Design a binder for these strands. Structure first.
Ligand code: ATP
Ligand code: MG
Ligand code: MG
Ligand code: MG
Ligand code: ZN
Ligand code: ZN
Lengths: 125, 1396, 105, 85, 86, 98, 90
RNA sequence: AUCGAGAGGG
DNA sequence: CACGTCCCTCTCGA
């Protein structure tokens, strides 16, 4: 606890003390391109260097699915890829996926990924 | 990668700056830029043979370039070009073009002047290239005609007074002519081959005709790239198409139908693009914008970010960063690195029989296993990723491969907080891989980085070669850095937990029993495993706190400290004495175990070693902390409670203080305020008022400290020095105090009142911002707000006024870069120019220097004899035979008493010399080799018998010393020049030597044997020869930090006390900025003028001197002025009058109080009026006996022509005193002077300070000491007393802002900067013009302000960069001739076979 | 040497004799000798055989030497000229006596 | 070209910490590149500790060419330079 | 009488959401009606108020039409929501 | 602050109008060297009136607000020491309640 | 300060010259579907502008963003159980 | 992605 | 009339 840092009771953390929830909200949409040619969400056949497998064939991950590193939480096509990989720095659990359309009618996607943060040696209080 | 090229490999030693010719651009150009089209043959990925890769660099990663087949990574790029249809002024040379056209016959092409003119043959003598070309253009723009002889030469056309409209030039004749680009170009081309050369130019590298662009160089893609997502070119690739668009308009607009008005437009348009293209932040101009502004090439290079943040500083591989936490079970020179970092951070180890067995295991462990590896690099060199390579298992390593392996336990790493204002803020530690994602560092290495473990973040860098490795461990190791040159003291020491519990431990009440003692003993890894016989035995074997502590202190240490009343039988366990690494008496606190000038840390690192002390740090953090673990220590609101008749006592102090300040409050309410001299009644009042609170609030802070027992916790932490200060206890328990914003108290934001809850015009302390309550009691609604105002003022210092000190340092570090001690002990720069002849005027290193006392100086002339004089021809004054071996057989010996005289004679020649250098009689100064220590470390070593006599001859002592001095080398040399600067360099040290090796002292108080003596001589010789600074030391970049760190760092701890102000941002940060920039408009020009020699203590001489320089005018005494018509009409005047002109009267009344406040009368006032106007005015006046003091003047339109005489008579009429001298304060200072008995004594003497600086006149006054006078305006002193006299004033004005808060930096640093500006001829300010203008290498001076501009006039004057300054090598990617680079390393076939 | 009381005609008239240095000082600054002041150290002229010595013994180039202004209140007092060097003995708080050298730029 | 002879030396006779550091480093980098070890590798693996043992026995075949400001220099052999530290 | 205090708060104002919109709406409506006086030579634009208003509330820079170089940048910022008090 | 609120903008005319109706001499016909001791009136930092009996009006207006017939946000000062009366329908004044 | 801008300050800026100006509670016009009952949460998730509407008698003008709890905003009048059912927070 | 804008941390 | 400390972490908009 020296120099204005502190000692945390791990027993009390295990019992839940200062356990945080965390959320992230990746977004993407099907872009419209002049001659009505538009993008599309889907598992493709260029590709990103991460694990597409956790995707579905609608280019999405369904909630309640663990995810790590550069996994794909959103597959898209402009073959010609525009898939959205997970934050290279987070290891979460998919929470809730949303699909609606724009004021242009574009297929609009928002993935939410959930993690519980746990008071670690180095955390600020 | 980069393939191998046959080409030889060299380093860059010369950088030739010049200018392209239009013909050389056409030469190198790998492809003519014909089209403005991006890269669109058919907008295919195939680019267009017109712009982008017509042969230049490649645009596609999967495409080799059309010139050098290497493609992408390897292709330097290849410049193109576009032939300009019409010449164009270069944006940067625009003004330099004019400066030339002003100098040369715009028709003849020859110079407007030549060698037949006295000033031109003078200016031409200047071979300084740029100072000549300035001294030419100065006296050339005037003479505006092509002369024909005037004793022939040469047609005669008058020259035009040229001016510039922006991108175009014009000159008047008598004719409005817009000077043409080609016409100027045609004039420049005809300039005499030798004419332009003598004009600051060059025959081959920088012809003037090339400041006009006839052919533009196109940079290849790598300069103006293009990235895909589809594509999109670079802001400069656009700007080029813009230039080419503007050109192709001219190409055709001028080929066919020439409409002249259009031709003269698309040309000016093109000139625009070529202009902004290079510089788009121009003087006038709109500053172009493309669908916006645009990126000028000059903007790429502008300081801070842009090759100053691409070359002076880079982002780097092999680096890391995370949160830092503190560890008491780590070693000082370590850094707990999280596992993950050590799996991403690697080190390219080379495969060798020494490591091959370890290396292959790692490889098999792979990139996932902690002690694994990531890459393997073969003979061929292609990288082999151990995560994906199939052969990541059956891979067989070869000797000479590289195994980029994980960083393991005990590798050297560069560690650093980020405010890198310190040599210490970047240290090298041993890696110690550990879990959790924090960097962990030993709590004692916090103070160097100024790190706490509160969301603090630290970088980590990792070497890549075994030599940069050794470079970190042999120079930048944390223990290597334990004692700083900054303040020649330890910069690490015990802090926090360990400190608080180490005085708690080192007590007499504090005893440790056996079950606790064996635990402590074990924690010491270097423990001798022997149980110390217990200080207390039998009742119950107990051990003293200090006693048990001593096994961690290493046997061989002797330390000695005396506090207040500390005896040899310590009263309150006072002071400190450690003998042979065991504690004798005294409590251990900050003084003992901190980073004290002569603390335990300091002593252990010198007489034992760097790494020895480091282990000491841990050996104490492991024990002391362990004891505190099981003793425990806390702190509550209970510790901020006095309440018991000490809060009944304090409250009274604040009551009278509201009456002692109410005293003056009512005094001046009825005028009865005896206003101080100089400071008005209001100013005065507040000054006394302001300290009646601060002196009372500070008296409740010692009343607080008193009640609080020795069992108080807040009190305990401050006693050890753990944390906390005197103020803290006061504010928390007693009283907060006045809140100071901008120095002064809380002012009246509302009209004449401080708050809408307060009476108007209320001056009381409660209204002006005095917090009568403490933090315990809790402030009031008002007390809080003011305290909140004062804090902000602080929070502003700590966040807004830090940019002042971070900038002064940048300048410091930039004007002192190349400054390093050289191999002849010269302190030079990158030109070889001598800044000093021995670093710190004694060639010493700042770390081996310690503040010991020269007893030869201060003290009684009587005691001097007693302590040094040895009279062999005498029965009373001779060394009693009990102290020498031959005291009775040498008693009376006269051939020997000749040397005891020679010795005693050089001692007095000493004493009287020191009193010349240290006029104030101060005898404690810093010098190498702690002699006060060495003799002690010799008494314990040979066990000196205070009874038995010494086995030394007078021959031994006085001659050993005489020979010891000859071997105390600084500069090694042969001729008299250097030898005579040897004597000098040492001279002072030898004074301490002869002082402490006095033949009386050696045998009376030291009791040295022979062996003990000779031992002391030889160790002194080395401890000195070690203290010599090392040729390589970057003393300049070091003094810069040493001066800049405390300034930037002091104004970061300003809110730790909230509203306190003090001299943080009052005379420190401010004046220092003045001092560095020099600047004549000093904010407080003061002349501290010392009195006369004789009558210095009697005031009347000072009161008479006061009025002789105070300066006085009519305006001073005058009350009112009135023009009258009267040819004899004034009532109260008609009496004084009975005792040609004009009926116009000028009548002015004077102030009685004023008139005699300056010891004035009327006749003096008058006679000067008569004298300033002579027999052209008629003047009369009353008397001092008169009721109305009046002067009546007649002229001798004249009513408004007389107002001129009044407004001239008021402020321009000089009475007594010297001009500019606006104020004068008389003051009595206590100056130390030697009494007739020889001892220094405190005899006051009167001195006067001014609010004006006219040195040239005030010194010549009769009645002062013209040798002691002093003005803080060092600028004026350089002007009056010469540069060398100024240098001292400069230093004195630098030190005077350093010795206030953070009151120590070592002479050397300050003197170097000081000498830096000095040794030029005059004051050379630390500013982008002051020093940056020197003859340094071009790139060097461009690394600090005026970045693109500097590189311009470099290539325009065909400048050459030496490549000797650090910045140069940094920009070039070469080892800089800096310490480890100041030498070269070679292998002689001889040696290699001597050990074949 | 001439001592103009309050003024001198610019009737320029000074540098006019080859084998003569035409020096000029005013009466006002000569009232108090500046070289007596606390901060002004001993300035010593260097013989042309001393300069040519110090320059080779410190292996120097003429430019590299610390410079003293031509019009320095002390450079005139000693009647320095271009190229003359002046050893300077100041009492330093590290060596007691420190030898510095300045050339008259 | 010019240079200085070993009987006209004048530089500090001890080893500059920067020289010692760059020599311990230089040899370490060379020793780790499979260069001959001129000292008795007594159970050593680290290429720095070998160089520290090589500099403790002064069996380092290197000469420090100390450049003085005037351009000219004066080599000192590692084995002749004292090592006070 | 004293010198007028520059930082006296009772004399400094606080342009809030409404007047901010006013400054934006006017410079916008002023330019929509300039396009109206061009329609002479409903077919009158409407994005000029829609987008030009979105433009400011999005960037934060306060429109000043579109070309707002260093002119009022940082007025519309996204809301913090790590705590309620935040 | 918490209590802190910001003005919003009132129309001045129904307040300028109640000034003339109660003792304001329009600036067009002002007699300086005749009615010199006359506190100046300032509606939104503009001067278009002066008054004979100031304190009686500071009280007359001060209760129009405290009633409502004058908006509660408009702040009004009388610099008795300087014989002046500034009134504000200004939009942007930060006021607290007391 | 938003309302006092709405309930008046609008018709002021208008002064071909136009008459009193009318504002619509916030709706959005999407690709097919035309009039969408646009709410805060709706546009918050769907990434749309909480834009009201501008109409004046000389006729459509543009879209005015409405601040929540303001004049032309729906939540101004609504209640706890209303917002709870509106996926909005009380 | 790049430029701009902003909010934090030490 | 040109500088205006050092790094580090995220958000968003053509
Ligand atoms: N603006 C800044 N510029 C440079 N360095 C800064 C700046 N702000 C903080 N620092 C550095 O970070 C540290 C700031 O101190 P810190 O914020 O850790 O507070 P503290 O002194 O622990 O405060 P407290 O009194 O509340 O304990 C110092 O080491 C300082 O050098
Ligand atoms: Mg901190
Ligand atoms: Mg802290
Ligand atoms: Mg802080
Ligand atoms: Zn190429
Ligand atoms: Zn001619």
């Amino acid at each position: 606890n020296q120099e204005d840092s502190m000692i945390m009771n791990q027993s009390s953390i295990d019992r839940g003390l200062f356990r945080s929830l965390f959320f992230r909200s990746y977004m993407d949409q099907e872009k419209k391109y002049g001659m009505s040619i538009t993008e599309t969400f889907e598992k493709p056949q260029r590709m990103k260097h991460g694990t597409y497998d956790k995707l579905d064939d609608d280019g999405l991950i369904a909630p309640g699915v663990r995810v790590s590193g550069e996994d794909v939480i959103i597959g898209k096509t402009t073959k010609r890829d525009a898939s959205t990989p997970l934050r290279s720095t987070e290891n979460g659990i998919v929470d809730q996926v949303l699909v609606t359309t724009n004021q242009d009618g574009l297929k609009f996607v928002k993935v939410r990924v959930r993690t519980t943060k746990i008071p670690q040696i180095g955390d600020k209080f | 990668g980069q393939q191998y090229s046959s080409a030889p490999l060299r380093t860059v030693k010369e950088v030739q700056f010049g200018l392209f010719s239009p013909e050389e651009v056409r030469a190198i150009s790998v492809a003519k830029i014909r089209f403005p089209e991006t890269m669109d043959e058919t907008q295919t990925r195939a680019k267009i043979g017109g712009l982008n890769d017509p042969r230049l660099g490649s645009i596609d990663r999967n495409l080799k370039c059309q010139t050098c087949q290497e493609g992408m990574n390897e292709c330097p790029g290849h410049f193109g070009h576009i032939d300009l249809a019409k010449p164009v002024f270069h944006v940067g040379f625009i003004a330099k073009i004019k400066k030339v056209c002003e100098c040369v016959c715009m028709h003849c092409g020859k110079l407007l002047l030549d060698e037949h003119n006295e000033l031109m043959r003078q200016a031409l003598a200047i071979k300084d290239s740029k100072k000549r070309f300035a001294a030419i253009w100065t006296l050339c723009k005037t003479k505006m005609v092509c002369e024909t002889d005037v004793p022939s030469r040469g047609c005669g056309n008058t020259q035009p007074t040229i001016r510039k409209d922006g991108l175009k030039l014009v000159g008047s004749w008598k004719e409005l002519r817009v000077l043409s680009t080609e016409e100027i170009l045609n004039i420049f081309k005809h300039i005499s081959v030798k004419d332009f050369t003598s004009l600051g130019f060059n025959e081959v590298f920088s012809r003037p005709e090339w400041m006009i662009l006839t052919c533009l160089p196109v940079p290849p893609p790598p300069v103006r790239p293009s990235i895909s997502f589809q594509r999109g070119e670079d802001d400069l690739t656009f700007k080029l198409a813009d230039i080419l668009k503007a050109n192709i308009s001219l190409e055709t607009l001028e080929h066919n139908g020439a409409p002249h008005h259009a031709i003269e437009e698309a040309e000016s348009l093109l000139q625009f693009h070529v202009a902004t293209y290079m510089d788009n932040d121009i003087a006038g101009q709109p500053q172009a914008l493309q669908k916006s502004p645009v990126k000028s090439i000059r903007a790429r290079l502008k300081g801070k970010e842009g090759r100053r943040g691409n070359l002076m500083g880079k982002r780097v591989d092999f680096s890391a960063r995370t949160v830092i936490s503190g560890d008491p079970n780590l070693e000082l020179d370590q850094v707990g690195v999280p596992k993950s970092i050590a799996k991403t951070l690697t080190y390219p180890e080379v495969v060798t029989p020494y490591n091959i067995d370890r290396l292959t295991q790692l490889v098999r462990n792979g990139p996932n296993e902690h002690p694994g590896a990531k890459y393997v690099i073969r003979d061929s060199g292609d990288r082999i990723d151990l995560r994906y390579s199939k052969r990541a298992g059956d891979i067989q390593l070869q000797y000479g491969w590289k195994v980029e392996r994980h960083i393991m336990d005990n590798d050297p790493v560069l560690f650093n907080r980020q405010p890198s204002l310190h040599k210490m803020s970047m240290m090298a530690h041993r890696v110690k891989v550990i879990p959790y994602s924090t960097f962990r560092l030993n709590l004692s290495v916090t103070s160097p980085y100024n790190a706490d473990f509160d969301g603090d973040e630290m970088n980590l860098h990792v070497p890549q070669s075994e030599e940069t490795r050794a470079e970190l461990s042999q120079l930048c190791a944390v223990p290597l850095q334990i004692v700083s040159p900054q303040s020649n003291k330890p910069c690490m020491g015990i802090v926090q937990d360990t400190l608080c519990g180490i005085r708690k431990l080192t007590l007499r009440d504090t005893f440790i029993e056996l079950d606790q003692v064996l635990n402590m003993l074990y924690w010491v890894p270097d423990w001798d495993g022997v149980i110390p016989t217990p200080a207390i035995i039998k009742p119950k074997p107990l051990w003293s706190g200090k006693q048990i502590l001593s096994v961690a202190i290493p046997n061989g240490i002797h330390l000695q400290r005396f506090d207040e009343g500390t005896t040899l039988l310590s009263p309150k366990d006072n002071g400190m004495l450690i003998i042979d690494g065991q504690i004798i008496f005294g409590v251990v606190e900050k003084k003992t175990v901190g980073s004290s000038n002569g603390g335990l840390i300091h002593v252990v690192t010198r007489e034992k070693g760097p790494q020895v002390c480091a282990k000491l740090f841990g050996n104490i953090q492991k024990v002391v902390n362990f004891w505190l673990l099981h003793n425990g220590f806390s702190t509550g609101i209970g510790d901020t409670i006095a309440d018991g008749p000490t809060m009944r006592e304090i409250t009274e102090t604040i009551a009278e203080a509201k009456k002692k300040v109410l005293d003056v409050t009512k005094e001046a309410q009825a005028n009865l305020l005896t206003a101080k001299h100089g400071m008005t009644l209001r100013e005065s009042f507040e000054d006394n008022v302001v300290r009646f609170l601060n002196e009372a609030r500070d008296k409740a802070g010692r009343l607080a400290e008193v009640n609080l027992k020795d069992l108080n916790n807040v009190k305990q932490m401050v006693m050890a020095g753990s944390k906390g200060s005197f103020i803290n206890i006061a504010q928390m328990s007693a009283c907060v105090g006045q809140q100071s914003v901008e120095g002064k108290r809380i002012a009246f934001g509302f009209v004449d009142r401080t708050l809408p809850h307060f009476s108007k015009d209320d001056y009381s302390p409660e209204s002006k911002g005095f917090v009568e309550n403490s933090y315990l009691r809790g402030l009031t609604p008002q007390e809080f707000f003011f305290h909140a105002m004062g804090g902000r003022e602080g929070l502003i210092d700590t966040a807004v006024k830090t940019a002042e000190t971070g900038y002064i340092q940048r300048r410091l570090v930039k004007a002192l870069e190349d400054i390093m001690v050289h191999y002849d002990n010269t302190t030079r720069n990158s030109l070889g120019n001598v800044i000093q002849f021995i670093y710190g005027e004694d060639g010493m290193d700042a770390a081996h220097i310690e503040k010991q006392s020269l007893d030869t100086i201060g003290g009684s002339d009587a005691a001097f004899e007693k302590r040094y004089r040895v009279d062999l021809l005498n029965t009373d004054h001779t060394l009693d035979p009990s102290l020498l071996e031959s005291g009775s057989e040498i008693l009376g010996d006269l051939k020997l008493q000749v040397l005891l005289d020679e010795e005693y004679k050089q001692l007095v020649k000493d004493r009287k010399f020191l009193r010349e250098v240290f006029v104030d009689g101060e005898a404690n100064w810093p010098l190498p080799v702690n002699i006060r220590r060495i003799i002690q470390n010799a008494q314990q070593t040979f066990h000196i018998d205070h009874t038995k006599p010494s086995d030394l001859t007078i021959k031994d002592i006085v001659l050993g010393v005489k020979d010891l001095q000859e071997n105390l080398l600084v500069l090694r040399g042969k001729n008299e020049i250097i030898q005579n600067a040897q004597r000098d360099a040492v001279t002072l040290f030898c004074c301490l030597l002869r002082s402490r090796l006095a033949t009386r002292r050696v045998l009376q108080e030291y009791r040295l044997t022979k062996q003990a003596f000779d031992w002391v001589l030889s160790n002194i010789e080395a401890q000195f020869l070690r203290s010599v600074v090392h040729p390589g030391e970057m003393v300049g970049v070091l003094a810069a930090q040493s001066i800049g760190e405390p300034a930037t760092q002091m104004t970061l701890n300003t809110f730790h006390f909230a509203g306190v102000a003090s001299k943080k941002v009052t005379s420190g940060v401010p004046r220092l900025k003045e001092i560095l920039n020099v600047a004549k408009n000093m904010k407080t020009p003061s002349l501290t003028v010392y009195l006369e020699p004789g009558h210095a203590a009697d005031q009347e001489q000072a009161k008479l001197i006061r009025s002789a320089i105070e300066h006085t005018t009519l305006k001073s005494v005058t009350i009112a002025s009135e023009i009258y018509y009267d040819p004899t009409v004034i009532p109260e005047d008609e009496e004084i009058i009975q005792l040609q002109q004009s009926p116009w009267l000028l009548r002015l009344e004077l102030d009685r109080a004023a008139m005699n406040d300056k010891d004035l009368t009327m006749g003096q006032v008058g006679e000067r009026i008569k004298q300033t106007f002579k027999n052209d005015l008629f003047v009369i006046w009353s008397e001092d006996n008169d009721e109305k003091l009046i002067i009546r003047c007649r002229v001798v339109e004249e009513d408004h022509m007389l107002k001129k005489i009044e407004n001239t008579m008021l402020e321009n009429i000089t009475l007594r005193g010297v001009e500019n001298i606006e104020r004068v304060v008389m003051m009595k200072y206590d100056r130390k002077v030697p009494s007739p008995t020889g001892e220094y004594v405190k005899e006051p003497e009167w001195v006067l300070e001014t609010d004006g600086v006219n040195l040239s006149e005030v010194m010549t006054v009769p009645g002062i000491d013209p040798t002691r006078i002093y003005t803080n305006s060092f600028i004026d002193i350089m002007e009056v007393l010469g540069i060398e006299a100024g240098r001292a004033a400069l230093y004195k004005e630098v030190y005077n802002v350093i010795a206030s808060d953070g009151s120590y930096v070592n002479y050397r640093h300050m003197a170097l900067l000081v000498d830096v500006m000095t040794t030029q001829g005059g004051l050379t300010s630390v500013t982008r013009h002051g020093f940056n203008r020197s003859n340094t290498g071009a790139l060097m001076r461009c690394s600090f302000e005026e970045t693109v501009e500097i590189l311009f006039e470099a290539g325009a004057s065909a400048e050459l960069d030496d490549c000797r300054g650090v910045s140069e090598n940094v920009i070039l990617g070469q080892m800089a001739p800096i310490g480890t680079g100041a030498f070269d390393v070679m292998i002689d076939e001889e040696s290699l076979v001597k050990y074949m | 040497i001439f001592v103009y009381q309050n003024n001198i005609t610019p009737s320029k008239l000074v540098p006019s004799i080859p084998p003569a240095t035409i020096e000029t000082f005013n009466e006002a600054a000569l009232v108090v000798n500046i070289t007596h002041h606390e901060l002004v150290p001993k300035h010593i002229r260097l013989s042309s055989d001393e300069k040519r010595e110090l320059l080779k013994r410190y292996r120097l180039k003429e430019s590299q030497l610390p410079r003293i202004q031509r019009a320095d209140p002390v450079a005139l007092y000693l009647g320095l000229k271009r190229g003359e060097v002046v050893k300077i003995i100041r009492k330093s708080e590290t060596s007691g006596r420190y030898a510095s050298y300045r050339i008259c730029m | 070209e010019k240079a200085i002879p070993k009987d006209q030396r004048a530089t500090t006779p001890y080893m500059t910490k920067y020289e010692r550091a760059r020599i311990l480093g230089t040899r370490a980098l060379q020793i780790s590149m499979n260069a001959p070890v001129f000292v008795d590798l007594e159970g050593e693996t680290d290429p720095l500790r070998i160089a520290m043992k090589e500099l403790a026995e002064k069996k380092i075949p290197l000469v420090i060419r100390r450049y003085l400001p005037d351009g000219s220099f004066e080599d000192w052999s590692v084995e002749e330079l004292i090592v006070d530290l | 009488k004293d010198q007028d205090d520059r930082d006296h708060f009772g004399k400094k104002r606080l342009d809030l959401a409404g007047p901010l919109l006013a400054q934006l709406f006017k410079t916008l409506f002023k330019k929509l009606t300039k396009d109206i006086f061009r329609y002479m030579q409903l077919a009158i634009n409407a994005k000029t108020i829609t987008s030009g208003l979105k433009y400011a509330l999005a960037t934060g820079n306060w429109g000043e039409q579109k070309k707002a170089m260093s002119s009022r940048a940082g007025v519309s910022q996204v809301l913090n929501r790590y705590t309620y008090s935040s | 602050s918490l209590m802190s609120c910001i003005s919003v903008g009132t129309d001045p005319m129904p307040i300028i109008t109640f000034l003339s109706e109660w003792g304001m001499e329009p600036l067009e016909d002002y007699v300086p060297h005749q009615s010199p001791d006359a506190t100046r009136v300032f509606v939104n930092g503009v001067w278009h009136g002066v008054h004979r009996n100031p304190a009686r009006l500071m009280e007359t207006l001060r209760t129009l607000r405290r009633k409502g017939d004058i908006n509660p946000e408009v702040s009004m000062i009388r610099d008795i020491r300087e014989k002046e009366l500034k009134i504000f329908t200004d939009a942007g004044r930060v006021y607290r309640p007391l | 300060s938003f309302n006092q801008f709405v309930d008046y300050t609008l018709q002021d800026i208008i002064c071909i010259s136009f008459g009193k100006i009318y504002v619509t509670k916030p709706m959005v016009n999407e690709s097919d579907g035309v009039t969408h009952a646009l709410y805060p949460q709706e546009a918050r998730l769907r990434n749309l502008t909480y834009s009201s509407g501008l109409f004046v008698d000389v006729v459509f003008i543009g879209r005015l963003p409405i601040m929540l709890r303001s004049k032309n905003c729906y939540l101004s009048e609504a209640t706890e159980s209303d917002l709870y059912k509106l996926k909005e927070c009380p």
